Amino acid sequence: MREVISIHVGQAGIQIGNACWELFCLEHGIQPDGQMPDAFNTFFSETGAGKHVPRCVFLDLEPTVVDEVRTGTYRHLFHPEQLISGKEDAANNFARGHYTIGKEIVDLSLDRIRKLADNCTGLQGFLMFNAVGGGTGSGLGCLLLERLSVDYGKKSKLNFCSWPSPQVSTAVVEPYNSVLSTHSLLEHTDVAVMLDNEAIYDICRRNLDIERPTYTNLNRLIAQVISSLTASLRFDGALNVDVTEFQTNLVPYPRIHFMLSSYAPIISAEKAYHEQLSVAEITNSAFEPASMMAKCDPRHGKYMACCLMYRGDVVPKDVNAAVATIKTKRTIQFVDWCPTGFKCGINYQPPTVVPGGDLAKVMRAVCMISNSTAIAEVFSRMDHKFDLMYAKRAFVHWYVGEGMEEGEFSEAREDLAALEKDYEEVGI
Amino acid sequence: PPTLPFHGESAYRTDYVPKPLPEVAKPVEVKLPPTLPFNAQSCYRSEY
């Protein structure tokens, strides 16, 4: 009955969704063709002779990265209507993806999400993965959340974005895509988690020792966050944290629903069996102000609530000591209207080794998703870039040509400006 | 000119193989303490 529907939009959403759907598929043991040689029900249906099919909807407007899915090893596991494509792409243009070329693929996406939700005996939430900073992830993705909220209401819409990183962005027009996609991420989103790419580069280059990581290695650690976040959905443990438990303990006020990630038993061979990885060691590295997966250092912020999801052979009393030693550390400060600020979950299933991967055998893990006033800087960083570019109206002739007026830019900077204002009033 | 043949295997194609299932067969076998046999040996037969 526990059932989460993943909706991966954008080129980046397809690729992070690839690394996700193997901690979902063959961690449950199902072969590439789709046969185990009912824990699979969290992510899979079942169609007779042991065929479990992913509960995913792949969306893109360029038919070239989803075509790699249709031609790769895993072409007979996906149904050949769950990999919805288009004829031409969106080209970092929020107005094209939302107003012009979005309204011919959105009618197919809502059909597949309908057929995958009436096959549901109780839908836990829509885990939609996107990349803020592009065209179809910021465009079509924004329209998808607006359509999903009107029809499929009252059940959660946990969104893990790929918010544009501060320095490294590999684009020029991404401030227009980020600020004008803030409206969907602020109203039509129940849980939003900021997850950039520089911080994954830093984790890979410091803990994991891969000094030359590719996007495929970035999709690794994003996927390990997702599997640990839905770990208690499918496997037993001392304490379970489903997606309703997750949002009710981490969202103080309805507008504030933005969080940070850290999954830091990041070890690799030479740095794996030398280090005793106890519950205290992994919890301290999770709260460490460099393994945050957003370049969002919380030493200048106030913690609000935490969601440490211990996963493996973790003893509950060791969780109790690890929470206590975080509380006594002074630089990890908490806001005053929150004496109890942790939601500890424990899974029994250990994390999984990677053959040809980057991690190794680890018996325990932590994945804490935390809300803080420190997340007010990931939006004020891009406030500087939007203000500079919109001063003399650069790149505006694109965005206005296909169907939005220039006042969309001003109201989205207003939506951003009313956004950071609500953080320092909550913190103070 | 030759064609550089495409070597490549994604994350989703590389980094997990089907693990062996965990070996679990252990109940909690509790030896019952036998009921301690009762002589709070009563009044009538006790004194008269």
Ligand SMILES: Nc1nc2c(ncn2[C@@H]2O[C@H](COP(=O)(O)OP(=O)(O)OP(=O)(O)O)[C@@H](O)[C@H]2O)c(=O)[nH]1
């Ligand atoms: N995690 C992850 N991020 C990626 C990947 N590829 C690109 N990105 C990020 O995506 C941002 C650019 O947005 P895209 O995802 O390419 O845009 P899109 O969703 O494909 O939509 P279009 O621009 O219309 O093609 C870059 O800043 C990258 O940081 C990837 O494979 N994995």
Ligand SMILES: [Mg+2]
């Ligand atoms: Mg795209």
